[PDB]
Design a protein around this ligand. Sequence first.
Ligand code: CLA
Ligand code: CLA
Ligand code: CLA
Ligand code: CLA
Ligand SMILES: CC(C)=CCC/C(C)=C/CC/C(C)=C/CC/C(C)=C/CC/C(C)=C/CC/C(C)=C/CC/C(C)=C/CC/C(C)=C/CC/C(C)=C/CC1=CC(=O)C(C)=C(C)C1=O
Ligand SMILES: CC(C)=CCC/C(C)=C/CC/C(C)=C/CC/C(C)=C/CC/C(C)=C/CC/C(C)=C/CC/C(C)=C/CC/C(C)=C/CC/C(C)=C/CC1=CC(=O)C(C)=C(C)C1=O
Ligand code: HEC
Ligand SMILES: CCCCCCCCCCCCO[C@@H]1O[C@H](CO)[C@@H](O[C@H]2O[C@H](CO)[C@@H](O)[C@H](O)[C@H]2O)[C@H](O)[C@H]1O
Ligand SMILES: CCCCCCCCCCCCO[C@@H]1O[C@H](CO)[C@@H](O[C@H]2O[C@H](CO)[C@@H](O)[C@H](O)[C@H]2O)[C@H](O)[C@H]1O
Ligand code: OEX
Ligand SMILES: [Cl-]
Ligand SMILES: [Cl-]
Ligand SMILES: [Fe+2]
Lengths: 97, 137, 244, 200, 171, 30, 36, 37, 33, 33, 56, 334
Amino acid sequence: ELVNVVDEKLGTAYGEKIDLNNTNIAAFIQYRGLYPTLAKLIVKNAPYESVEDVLNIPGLTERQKQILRENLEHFTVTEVETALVEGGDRYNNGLYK
Amino acid sequence: AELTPEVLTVPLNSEGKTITLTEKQYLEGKRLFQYACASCHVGGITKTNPSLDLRTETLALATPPRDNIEGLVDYMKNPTTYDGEQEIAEVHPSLRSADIFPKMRNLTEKDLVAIAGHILVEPKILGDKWGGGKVYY
Amino acid sequence: QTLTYDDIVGTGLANKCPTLDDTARGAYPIDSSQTYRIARLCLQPTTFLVKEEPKNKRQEAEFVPTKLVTRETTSLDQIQGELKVNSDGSLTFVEEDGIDFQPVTVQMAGGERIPLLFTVKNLVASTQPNVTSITTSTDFKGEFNVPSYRTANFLDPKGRGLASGYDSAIALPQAKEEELARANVKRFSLTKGQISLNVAKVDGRTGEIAGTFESEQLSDDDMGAHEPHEVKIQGVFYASIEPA
Amino acid sequence: YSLGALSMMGFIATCFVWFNNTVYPSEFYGPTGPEASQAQAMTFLIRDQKLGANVGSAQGPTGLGKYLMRSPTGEIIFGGETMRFWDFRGPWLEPLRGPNGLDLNKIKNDIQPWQERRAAEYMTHAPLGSLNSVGGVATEINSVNFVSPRSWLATSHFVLAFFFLVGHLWHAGRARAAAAGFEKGIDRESEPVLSMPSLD
Amino acid sequence: LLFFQGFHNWTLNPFHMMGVAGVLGGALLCAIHGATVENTLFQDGEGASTFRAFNPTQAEETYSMVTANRFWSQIFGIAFSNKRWLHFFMLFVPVTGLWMSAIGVVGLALNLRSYDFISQEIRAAEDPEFETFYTKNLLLNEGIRAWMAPQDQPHENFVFPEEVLPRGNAL
Amino acid sequence: METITYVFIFACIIALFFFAIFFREPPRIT
Amino acid sequence: METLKITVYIVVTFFVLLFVFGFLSGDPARNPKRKD
Amino acid sequence: MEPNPNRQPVELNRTSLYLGLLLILVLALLFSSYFFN
Amino acid sequence: MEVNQLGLIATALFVLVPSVFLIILYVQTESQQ
Amino acid sequence: MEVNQLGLIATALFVLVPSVFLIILYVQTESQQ
Amino acid sequence: AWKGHAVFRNKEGEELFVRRMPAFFESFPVILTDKNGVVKADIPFRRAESKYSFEQ
Amino acid sequence: ANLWERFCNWVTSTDNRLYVGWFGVIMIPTLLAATICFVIAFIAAPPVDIDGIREPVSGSLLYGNNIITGAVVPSSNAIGLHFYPIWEAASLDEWLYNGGPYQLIIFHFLLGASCYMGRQWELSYRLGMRPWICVAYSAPLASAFAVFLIYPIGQGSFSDGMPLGISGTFNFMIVFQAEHNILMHPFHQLGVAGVFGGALFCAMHGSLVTSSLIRETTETESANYGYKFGQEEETYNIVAAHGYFGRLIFQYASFNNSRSLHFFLAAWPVVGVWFAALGISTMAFNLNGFNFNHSVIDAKGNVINTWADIINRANLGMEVMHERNAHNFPLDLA
Ligand code: CLA
Ligand code: CLA
Ligand code: CLA
Ligand code: CLA
Ligand SMILES: CC(C)=CCC/C(C)=C/CC/C(C)=C/CC/C(C)=C/CC/C(C)=C/CC/C(C)=C/CC/C(C)=C/CC/C(C)=C/CC/C(C)=C/CC1=CC(=O)C(C)=C(C)C1=O
Ligand SMILES: CC(C)=CCC/C(C)=C/CC/C(C)=C/CC/C(C)=C/CC/C(C)=C/CC/C(C)=C/CC/C(C)=C/CC/C(C)=C/CC/C(C)=C/CC1=CC(=O)C(C)=C(C)C1=O
Ligand code: HEC
Ligand SMILES: CCCCCCCCCCCCO[C@@H]1O[C@H](CO)[C@@H](O[C@H]2O[C@H](CO)[C@@H](O)[C@H](O)[C@H]2O)[C@H](O)[C@H]1O
Ligand SMILES: CCCCCCCCCCCCO[C@@H]1O[C@H](CO)[C@@H](O[C@H]2O[C@H](CO)[C@@H](O)[C@H](O)[C@H]2O)[C@H](O)[C@H]1O
Ligand code: OEX
Ligand SMILES: [Cl-]
Ligand SMILES: [Cl-]
Ligand SMILES: [Fe+2]
């Protein structure tokens, strides 16, 4: 049958954690030191096959890798949901205040 | 309800010394916030970047923390991005860019404290309204 | 002789690809040791054809010509990417970024509007092997992705959408839901389209190529509410090869 | 005749102050209505492209470009509702515009900080506000004390030009009736309709 | 007024529409009758300010019904020819309009609204490309209800979390 | 049938306008 | 479309010309009292 | 304009009313089954 | 019963249209002098 | 459109019934002496 | 037939309660509260920042 | 007499059943063009992408609508204030998609209705009347210019003009309140006092004259037969009507001058509707109604809501829902 894939993805770890393959960039504000610089690099180099693949991003300072290490417990990775990444929606999902 | 000393007592630094502002200080801060900041920050939001508001919990997760008086005063001197990584004075009003943001020219340290106190007192007054946008109007 | 915005504005030439003169029948040497990129790929569609669906299964289901109703809003332009030189001598355009989509509505006889996202989003397109010079016989064949014509925030007239909106028909609070399910559940399609760029003119000096394209892709499905049509797009192209 | 002439001129000046940013410079009068809407689209293009977005290829909810799209003659213009204001021309924006409209390569590379400051300042000083001078949309809360001079000048001169047209009609009809001699009413001893044939 | 739009869709109600026609018709009749009299006045004095040329005890009409009738017959096609019917019609129009509006409100007392057109709702629910100004107004109505009800009806103790609120894109 | 109905009533109104203007009872001065 | 444009321009000009020349045709004198 | 002299009054007496209404109603009683089908 | 959807209006107008034609003609006959 | 099945006859009688009432009354007025 | 009484529970086992439609409302959102009126679940309109979806 | 003199004598002829006149030589073709295109587009036009977002709104009867929901839909937001005649389109199909008929109808109508105003001066001049009926008609004419032309000019698009339809009218009203708070604007309030007052004074003047009709008829006849067209005596007793109304309120609140009375009947609705037209026309440049959102504040700083804050909550719901796919950025600036 037909399913809302966005409603389904809230049933996964996307509904709880920041999904590095799908979640809009503004959700990196929820933790210290990710936005904008590290948030930009994470979205640019998505997708990832695991959270620990976020430390492999080329060009990171050791301070940048330490910050990501402190925040891997808030990250997850699921399959790329095309309804969430198309339209530029990871940079602007049409939500403001 | 009244604007008591406990309402007017906000963090001064990152350690934990507090400052109890006067009602004259809070009311001067509201006047100067309206004068210099409310064109983008009306109600505690940010019109030109709605992702970053002026809520107390949001300023706490900024790098360096902006959830005290001295953190907000340093931001009004040398504003950064939310991680502190870039210096954004060329696009954000500050003392160090008063030549391009001319409403920042005649701001004293007493004025910067007063604006910083208004940013900290106002969510204790308004609750979720401050930084909430139109949902809470 | 180079034009400005006040010359171009409101003339329709902004929706046109640049042309090469009839004299430019030359050839552009691809040095295999040096890398290349595309400074600007323009695609100007001239003809939109839609395949009919005769309710018979069999019959002659040919592509019928349609009338454009959304005006001179159709061209893809300012497309950039890396023009690789492969091992076997072929060149593969990988599309990076640009104005690579235009919503287009054409209208068939009977008045049926057909919306489509005319696009070359993420175009990988390759030539034939042993092409040491881009000549007037070069053919870039390739494929691209056709995302959904509306994105996920789009709300239907009853307020239903994918990432936003109602999940049911609120004006019929006690209707049976299974007949309304194809309208109530919005679905984001992602399909493939095929395109063949045929070079006709080459600037051997500057590196400007031009020619014709033919592109085939699905039209809009209204977020899963109806079947998309098959569209054939024809038109001209222009590409400028800068060495990188 | 002067009343009709003045009414026509007041309507013209109303459109002058509303649209023209040459003889009413935006540094003195504030951004025009079109200018501020163009400046919002510029602001959110700049912010989102700083976050890493490819603004030329970003699709909006409708399938039009979220930031950039084509005008009906094909020029590259700002997307969203501000598609209606693609005829706006201002000195902070014209550096980004090429021969076929807004240049994607210029937008990626050459947006100076003074343009970003101008776009944010003009977006936040849009000529919208209340009669008690609360700035912004009708749903905005009290804080900002702003009504743009362009709004004050256009609205005042619309009112004046309208009433001057009414005065033109009043005085022109009265001058005709006074010259023809019936501005004080119909002579009972020679009523004109009474010597006309019936319509049926 | 805004409550009746968002909850009752009161503009769609034919009894309100009949009230609108009675009010705006009566205002038209007030303006058109006053202007016609004042512009078909008989010259009954020498002043250019013509109010003094009426005397409250005169038997004669102060304005020309014949001239008024010919003007409107040629401008508009029809015209009053009976002054008594004219003044009755000036009673009738806004009085009937207000009475018609009262009946529609009596229906709204029971929530007997002219809220929807069923045939448009059946079509819109199955055809997500079908849009009218009527379906557009119902989206506005849904906005009005969800945004105003928690404060307008504070006895209901409505907590509508922000994610339940109907909104368009961006705004 | 709906569209026919609405157009029919409209056409009858427009016909009524014709008779009300051109075939009115003529106002008579007496 | 050009032929429609020329038709409408000719038609509009014709009616504007009748309005202008008509109001220039001694309009103040066309009244029931002072036919000067 | 002078009146048209070709005009004539029209009549339908009561018996003709009863006869016609009988004819219309019986024709409707007959054909209604076929109109409903 | 699944009857013709137009049968009711076809019957109603078949009665009412010539019936009122006769009623008009009869009543104007009675009002004559 | 899935409209009310009685809407056509309801409209047709809403017109025709008071319209013919006025036509009857008008025509018998004209036939008076 | 009566389908029987619906009891709604979250993943923590706590019973939720669907907020009933008042007669004024042609449509009404789906909001589920605990026994003390605190919202625990809903059917959200916008999904991107949703925290109380039935899936969540 | 040459043909031009014979033609001018016909055009300005007071013996024509409907007066033509020089304003009429413009009024007649433009209104016919606007009417014909309106009836056709109301019956049979295809849907129109009013908001420029490839989301066409069905306006015609043949495409689903009824009398209430039908409209000629305003032209596309992609057009803006651009002049869009038929000859600008590449085809009639494109013209219809982009809302071509709307521009044709409103331009012809506003030109024709302006000439209707001039025609009202013109005939009053030909009949020897006083000239100011056309000043009274300037009140609804200005309102029509306000919603069809002045409001599109200020907002930058004919997509924002009032649609030519009953439900589209209500859509125009609700969105206008969302963006401008028109109810809180004093020019609309003066407009309401104009039309409520106009309806009151219509009923008042109608009842007072009907109440004081001189007995000329028996019980078995309509009282309207007591008046004969063109009779010289007045048909009611104005002294009795003043004696009633001067006792209903008090003597000096009642008119004893019929000229002063009828001028007041003209002046009250016209001035009010003039102000209503200037309401729309100045909200066109976004000088909005009164904003008292969060005006009442307690001693601590808590917002104390008023009825104005409740209005704002309704305005927010209209705001966030209108044109739900058309906004990409957080401010609705036009
Ligand atoms: C072109 C005319 C014009 C324009 C555009 C402005 C605009 C402005 N004035 Mg100025 N001013 C004007 C004429 C004008 N004024 C006049 C004539 C005076 C003498 C009274 C002033 C004296 C003045 C002072 C003292 C101040 C301003 C201020 C201002 C600013 C804020 C206005 C405000 O809040 O209004 C409030 C709104 C109203 C009072 C409502 C106006 C509605 C009008 C009256 C309707 C008129 C319609 C019609 C003509 C009248 C009915 C007639 C009809 C029956 C025919 C604004 C820039 C203020 C400012 O900011 O200074 C720096 C300020 O303090 N003005
Ligand atoms: C309440 C009454 C009122 C008020 C306060 C205003 C106020 C204003 N009007 Mg308005 N106006 C009004 C009624 C009013 N108007 C009416 C009833 C009408 C007819 C409907 C108009 C028609 C009108 C138009 C058409 C325009 C204005 C404009 C203006 C603004 C500038 C005025 C100006 O500079 O004039 C001009 C002054 C003169 C003509 C006087 C002589 C000036 C000389 C030539 C100056 C030379 C200067 C030069 C630099 C000298 C250099 C010397 C060299 C050797 C160094 C000002 C805010 C302007 C505006 O801002 O539009 C939005 C404008 O364009 N008004
Ligand atoms: C709503 C617009 C309007 C109306 C109904 C009137 C009405 C009148 N004008 Mg006035 N006039 C106006 C605006 C208007 N005017 C304006 C803005 C000006 C300044 C330019 C004038 C300047 C003016 C002068 C100089 C005179 C009049 C006079 C008059 C009176 C006699 C008829 C006449 O000769 O008018 C001529 C009509 C106009 C000047 C404009 C009317 C515009 C409407 C819309 C008709 C448009 C017709 C046109 C062919 C359409 C163009 C179509 C387009 C596609 C090309 C009559 C009461 C005369 C008079 O008797 O005064 C005592 C006179 O001598 N008017
Ligand atoms: C085209 C615009 C328009 C027009 C002309 C109308 C017209 C009307 N509306 Mg509608 N309305 C509209 C748009 C419009 N509406 C829109 C868009 C909405 C949103 C959906 C509404 C929502 C709406 C509602 C909710 C109601 C109306 C009602 C009415 C009717 C009011 C009659 C009246 O005067 O009551 C005025 C009040 C009275 C006549 C009662 C008696 C008043 C006494 C006599 C006054 C005594 C005063 C006293 C002496 C002292 C006063 C002191 C002073 C200082 C205060 C009238 C038919 C009302 C209605 O339908 O009533 C049945 C109603 O409840 N409208
Ligand atoms: C298929 C197609 C194309 C569809 C059409 C599309 C479409 C949208 C259709 C519109 C539908 C529509 C019309 C709906 C509106 C229906 C509506 C709301 C119904 C109201 C019905 C109703 C019973 C209301 C109750 C209130 C009431 C009775 C109102 C009546 C209002 C009314 C008609 C007022 C009169 C207005 C009028 C113009 C009168 C002018 C009179 C006149 C000639 C005055 C002149 C005059 C003045 C003098 O002073 C003197 C002295 C003389 C001598 C003189 O002459
Ligand atoms: C139990 C106890 C203690 C009982 C004791 C009671 C008792 C006996 C007390 C008596 C003492 C006493 C009077 C007490 C005072 C109490 C008190 C002050 C009461 C408050 C009442 C109150 C609310 C005030 C009433 C308000 C009121 C109606 C005022 C408004 C007045 C009004 C609208 C004036 C403007 C009039 C206006 C110009 C409109 C014109 C209308 C119009 C166009 C009419 C058309 C028209 C007019 C004509 O003119 C004629 C001619 C004709 C043709 C005609 O068309
Ligand atoms: C718009 C033109 C602004 C004006 C005027 C002022 N500020 Fe602002 N502020 C603005 C933006 C776009 C941003 C985000 C910058 C970024 O990181 O990209 C900010 C940010 C702040 C912050 C930080 C908020 C946080 O969550 O940490 C603060 C504390 C702040 N601004 C304060 C502030 C003050 C006190 C102002 C008046 C002098 C002021 N800002 C002006 C936009 C604009
Ligand atoms: C817009 C294009 C035209 C621009 C015009 C600018 C120049 C205007 C002068 C042109 C000529 C106007 O000149 C005018 O012509 C007409 C037309 O015959 C003359 O002739 C008229 O005579 C009398 C006038 O009392 C009328 O009854 C008659 O019907 C008419 O023939 C007018 O007496 C003369 O005043
Ligand atoms: C749905 C179906 C509806 C069908 C409508 C039917 C229309 C029928 C039209 C019948 C019209 C009869 O028309 C009417 O005839 C009568 C006599 O007959 C005329 O009456 C004339 O003659 C009579 C009798 O000699 C005189 O008393 C009278 O004074 C004179 O006018 C009317 O002046 C005319 O108006
Ligand atoms: O179009 Mn018709 O409505 Ca005047 O705001 Mn902007 O745009 Mn849209 O939004 Mn809100
Ligand atoms: Cl809407
Ligand atoms: Cl937008
Ligand atoms: Fe009267």
